[PDB]
């Protein structure tokens, strides 16, 4: 089953870290910009915006630890490697292997959780941060009500103790990944996605080890990630890095949000823009998303 | 090859306008309708129904759509699997037996039918017992992070079709066994009679049965919540004398103190915990049967 090179001109780099390799497509030149995907995707989700960012930046499009073609560190009882704090530290190490100790960061979905956690933990690593269509994990859980529980049911479903989610996801993995992709778009189908991108997501999701990692991610997201976020809320720790919060008008941020109002509690300097899109901003609305990121990141 | 767990109990297929209700019927005395819940069938009562049968005409029904009951075709509002519709269909079923006033004991989903029955048609009930539940409204209202993780299935099975159906269809044995085991005090299948587990597993192996359960949970996330919301915001209380029983390690006690909650819903409620997980009549048969016999008797 052959895939598709969706980043023409970009190189391919297996970045060695102490918890395993990070796969990344690297193109462009200029200030380093790391682009982090989320669930249930891989780096290829940036394929429509990364060329436009590559005009101005050294764009590093990385598979999250455990995701896509990045190595899968062995998990533990606390899902430590798939906590956003550990993923951020592994990505910091990955960026250091490239000589990037101060970089711009745009993240989407899980990658955006890594990204704001990275900004909280190691703010000196970031010139500017963009999070696409998330609120902090703390906020999703604190806003957990009937409406949210149904909308983001997978936050509780995938966090169930193994192997419950894994065994169920195995029941129809192709359906599940496609349903996630479709149900969070504005259209509600797969029409916003490049079918070559969908094949990337389908093949990653077709591996049980990969699905296990994603559940480890959401288990982290229910436990350690929430705890880590809680310490910051209760200690008043704000993200000091210049921040851009993008969200879809029909995405997984706007619901119980005003995402900018939420993010202003979390960051001292945050700008915000709704994007005519569902959750998958870079694929549903690439030009709009790319323009907003280019405008925000162009400086350095 | 399914075992008869109610020796000497009759078998009735009760016609209703919404399809047949299966029921085991035994004993004599005042009518007592027993309703199971998810992911079970009427046979979950097989340890406590005989003791009830010395005192009452025990009717052990499969819920609409569950077990051997017919499955009415659902719709976009999941209407026949709302507790309101289920209550009405069971009212019909009982009327077909000449039972227009009866005692009612419900567990899990069947308890949700029961308290909805008591809110919609209190005149139909002499006494009500609900086993290890709070009103659906109260679960959704207490759905914070801890609870959303605890009863994730309330949100998961409520996802639009065919998402839970498609995940459940890969290995349905695992999930029914997982749900049975996870909600017991012990956390395995030791509390259950293996023959009862076979009943639950065989029912769960039917994709239409599984769909019904999802529709039940979809009704639980939507219409049922809405119906409950109307009552609690109108201050409508259950006037029927009722017993709330719950497992100390069950589900109802995870959200709040069950008796405090039920006193908001019922003007005449008594309560007692039983050392048990969720499945009171199978994990704690003697204690459950004793509590029910005592409460339903004079």
A11 three-state secondary structure: strand
Cα separation, A18 vs A37, whole angstroms: 21
Cα separation, B244 vs B114, whole angstroms: 12
Cα dihedral value A153, A159, A163, A166, nearest 10: 50
Least CB-CB distance to B167: which of A142, A168, A183? A168
Residues of chain B neighbouring A179 (CB-CB closer than 8 A): 163, 166
CB-based contacts of B11: which residues, under 8 Å, 6+ apart?
B22, B23, B24, B25
The CA distances from residue A224 to A70, A77, A78, A141, A227, in Å, are 22, 11, 7, 12, 5
Q: B170, A175: Cβ pair inside 8 Å?
A: no
Binding residues of B for fluoroacetate: 109, 112, 153-154, 217
CB A240 within 8 A of CB A268: yes
Tell me which of A63, A109, A133, A229 is the catalytic residue. A109
Cα separation, B31 vs B102, whole angstroms: 5
Residue B17 burial (10 A CB sphere; 0-12, 13-18, 19+): exposed
Helix count and strand count (H, E) for chain A: 14, 8
Cα separation, B122 vs B266, whole angstroms: 11
A279 classed as catalytic? yes
Q: Tokens 């002499």 identify what position? A: B126
Sequence-distant contacts of A164-169: CB under 8 A, at least 24 apart: A164/B178, A165/A211, A165/A215, A165/A218, A166/A208, A166/A211, A166/A212, A166/A215, A167/B170, A167/B171, A167/B174, A167/B175, A167/B178, A168/B167, A168/B168, A168/B170, A168/B171, A168/B175, A169/A211, A169/A215, A169/B167
Q: Which domain holds residue B212?
A: 1-298
CB B267 within 8 A of CB B235: no
Residues of chain B neighbouring A137 (CB-CB closer than 8 A): none
Residues of chain A neighbouring B149 (CB-CB closer than 8 A): 156, 159-160, 222
Q: Which residues of B are catalytic?
A: 108, 278
Chain A residue at shortest CA distance from B163: A176
B267 touches A at CB < 8 Å: no
Cα separation, B117 vs B104, whole angstroms: 9
Q: What angle do CA A249, A281, A262 make, to 5 degrees?
A: 55
Cα separation, B105 vs B114, whole angstroms: 7
Cα separation, A62 vs A91, whole angstroms: 9
Q: Would strands B57-61 and B21-27 be described as parallel, antiparallel, or unpaired? A: antiparallel
Cα separation, A82 vs A65, whole angstroms: 7
A103 three-state secondary structure: strand
Cα dihedral value A169, A171, A173, A177, nearest 10: -60
A134 three-state secondary structure: coil
Experimental resolution (Å): 1.8
Q: B155, A160: Cβ pair inside 8 Å?
A: no
A158 secondary structure, DSSP code? T
Cα dihedral value A213, A219, A221, A223, nearest 10: -150
| φ, ψ of residue A207 in degrees (nearest 5) | -90, 125
Cα separation, A184 vs B54, whole angstroms: 56
Cα separation, A173 vs B170, whole angstroms: 10
Number of domains in chain A: 1
Cα separation, A144 vs A286, whole angstroms: 30
A133 classed as catalytic? no
Q: Which of residues 106-165 of B touch A (CB under 8 A)?
A: 140-141, 143-145, 148-149, 152, 154-156, 158-160, 162-163
Helix (H) or strand (E) segment spanning residue B281:
helix B280-283
Helix (H) or strand (E) segment spanning residue B190:
none
Cβ count within 10 A of residue A273: 16
Instruction: Report the CATH number that the domain containing residue A212 is assigned in CATH.
Output: 3.40.50.1820
Binding residues of B: 109, 112, 153-154, 217
Residue ranges of alpha helices (H) inside chain A are 50-54, 84-97, 110-121, 137-142, 146-151, 153-157, 164-171, 173-183, 195-205, 208-222, 224-235, 259-266, 281-284, 286-297
CB A105 within 8 A of CB A115: yes
Query: Angle at which helices B83-96 and B223-234 pack, to 10 degrees?
Result: 90
Cα separation, A33 vs B6, whole angstroms: 69
CB A203 within 8 A of CB A3: yes
Residue A46 burial (10 A CB sphere; 0-12, 13-18, 19+): buried
Q: Shortest Cα distance from A167 to chain B (angstroms)?
A: 8
């Amino acid at each position: 089953p052959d895939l598709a090179d969706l980043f023409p001109g970009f190189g391919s780099e297996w970045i060695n870290t102490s918890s395993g390799r990070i796969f990344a497509r690297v193109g462009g030149d200029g200030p380093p910009l790391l682009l982090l995907h989320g669930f249930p995707q891989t780096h290829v989700m940036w394929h429509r915006v990364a060329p436009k960012l590559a005009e101005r930046f050294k764009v590093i499009v990385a598979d999250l630890p455990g995701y896509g073609w990045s190595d899968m560190p062995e998990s533990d009882e606390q899902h430590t490697p798939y906590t956003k704090r550990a993923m951020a530290k592994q990505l910091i190490e990955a960026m250091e292997q490239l000589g990037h100790v101060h970089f711009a960061l745009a993240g989407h979905d899980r990658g955006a959780r890594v990204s704001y956690r990275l900004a909280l933990d190691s703010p000196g690593r970031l010139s500017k941060l963009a999070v696409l269509d998330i609120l902090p994990t703390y906020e999703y859980w604190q806003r957990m009500n009937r409406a949210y529980a149904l909308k983001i049911y997978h936050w509780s479903f995938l966090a169930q103790p193994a192997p419950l989610p894994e065994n169920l996801l195995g029941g129809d993995p192709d359906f599940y990944v496609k349903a996630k992709l479709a149900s969070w778009t504005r259209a509600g189908d797969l029409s916003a996605f490049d079918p070559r991108a969908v094949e990337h997501y389908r093949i990653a999701f077709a591996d049980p080890m990969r699905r296990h990692v994603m559940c480890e991610d959401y288990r982290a997201g229910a436990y350690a990630d929430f705890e880590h976020d809680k310490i910051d809320v209760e200690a008043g720790n704000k993200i000091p890095v210049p921040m851009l919060a993008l969200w879809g008008a029909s995405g997984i941020a706007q619901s119980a949000a005003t995402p900018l109002d939420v993010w202003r509690k979390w960051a001292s300097d945050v700008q915000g823009a709704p994007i005519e899109s569902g959750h998958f901003l870079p694929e549903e609305a690439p030009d709009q998303t790319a323009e907003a990121l280019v405008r925000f990141f162009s400086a350095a």
